[PDB]
Amino acid sequence: AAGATLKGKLHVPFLLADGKCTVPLAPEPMITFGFRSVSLKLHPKNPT
């Protein structure tokens, strides 16, 4: 319209709020040793 359109204010629901979410945990890696060296065999399920 022409004159002055701003009549009121709404409130937006479902805002981004905090909490806790259950994220996965990788399989236990295999750790071989060596002089000044650590060798790791890694076997994931999903990308990690």
Partner: protein, 394 residues
């Protein structure tokens, strides 16, 4: 009686040392730092979060002409389009084939989720290292937060403890920091108003809840389709999303000298760097006299085993013949070997066992007991294992 020392900045490594006046007995002192903090002083410059393009509704005029009217909004662009012929559902908006007019207004405002999805920009300076200590002085254990300023003492039991200054000015934190998702990044963010469209700073509010925001997104208006009512906007994407995708992983996982980064009261803990000096005023009553503590006679140290591992892989033994039965302290002054037991029980004609760690293959160290010293020697062997889970106690 004043005493000083130089304890390394390292958690878990239980430092031990002995105060040694002449007419009085040795007083042991066992100091385990549990948590060594490094709290910068921080100044907030701005917060930047996602943007929302605010498209005011189209003012359509038919057989007429409208002129723009600046409402001074952030990045308000305003254009007028001629040769429009809209469609609502009902049909055409007006007969005037040409000589129609469509005022487009577009601006840029801060997302509704900015109370909880906002990155805080910080200038850091003048860190105040702060150490939690577990301190045992003559069976009078205490637990204390202390500051490593020059003169910031802590006074328990009449024992006065001063700490610092630290032997390094290093911070993993630089002059420009960003905080997001409970995670601290080291990013050269621009100043208020020097943003650019596409990266951190395209929107700039002082606080999470402020009024004036600086916007720059390359907001360009385009012409609408023939038979449509819309404000077609092309602009640069959220620079916040690009800081998120291309992330430059956090100082929690990229800080040197082994630092553990934490949140709001920003701190970097257990930074294995530097040696902190101490200074202890000890009131005279904590000192027993040597005439009332067992003066030894005819001591001699052997060495049962020596593995120069990281742990206390060394076991030495002392034969002795004291005057009473009780308690004394032991310390290896040199760095040749470091002890585990800061105090040993002593019978009259017993043989006492002492545990230590070393890095020398042919040790020869001076070991103290109640008053007198002993020269403990031997030969060591390598460790069978070559990876561990704790650091070097020596």
């Amino acid at each position: 009686y004043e005493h000083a020392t130089t304890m390394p900045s390292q958690a878990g490594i239980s430092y031990n040392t002995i105060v040694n006046r002449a007419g009085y007995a040795p007083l042991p002192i066992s100091i385990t730092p549990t948590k060594i903090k490094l709290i910068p002083t921080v100044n907030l410059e701005y917060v930047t979060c996602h943007y929302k393009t605010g498209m005011d509704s189209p003012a359509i005029k038919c057989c007429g002409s409208q002129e723009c009217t600046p409402t001074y909004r952030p990045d308000e662009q305003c254009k007028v389009f001629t040769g429009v012929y809209p469609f609502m559902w009902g049909g055409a908006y007006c007969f005037c084939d040409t000589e129609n007019t469509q005022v487009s207004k577009a601006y840029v405002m801060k997302s509704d989720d900015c109370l909880a999805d906002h990155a805080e920009a910080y200038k850091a300076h003048t860190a105040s290292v702060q150490a939690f200590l577990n301190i045992t002085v003559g069976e009078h254990s205490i637990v204390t937060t202390v500051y490593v300023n020059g003169e910031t003492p802590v006074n328990f039991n009449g024992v006065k403890i001063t700490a610092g200054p630290l032997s390094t000015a290093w911070t993993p934190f630089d002059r420009k920091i960003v905080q997001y998702a409970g995670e601290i990044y080291n990013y050269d963010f621009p100043e208020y108003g020097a943003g650019q469209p596409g990266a951190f700073g395209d929107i700039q509010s002082r606080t999470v809840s402020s009024s004036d925001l600086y916007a720059n997104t390359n907001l360009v208006l385009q012409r609408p389709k023939a038979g449509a009512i819309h404000v077609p906007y092309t602009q640069a994407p959220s620079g916040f999303e690009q800081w998120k995708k291309d992330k430059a992983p956090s100082l929690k996982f990229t800080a040197p000298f082994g630092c553990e980064i934490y949140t709001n009261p920003i701190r970097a803990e257990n930074c294995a760097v530097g040696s902190i000096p101490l200074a202890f005023d000890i009131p005279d009553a904590l000192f027993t006299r040597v005439s009332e503590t067992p003066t030894l006679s005819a001591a001699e140290c052997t060495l049962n085993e020596c593995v120069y591992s990281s742990d206390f892989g060394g076991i030495a033994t002392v034969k002795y013949s004291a005057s009473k039965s009780g308690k004394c302290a032991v310390h290896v002054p040199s760095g040749t070997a470091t002890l585990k037991e800061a105090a040993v029980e002593l019978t009259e004609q017993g043989s006492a066992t002492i545990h230590f760690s070393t890095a020398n293959i042919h040790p020869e160290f001076r070991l103290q007991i109640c008053t007198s010293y002993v020269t403990c020697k031997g030969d060591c062997h390598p460790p069978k294992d070559h990876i561990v889970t704790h650091p070097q106690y020596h």
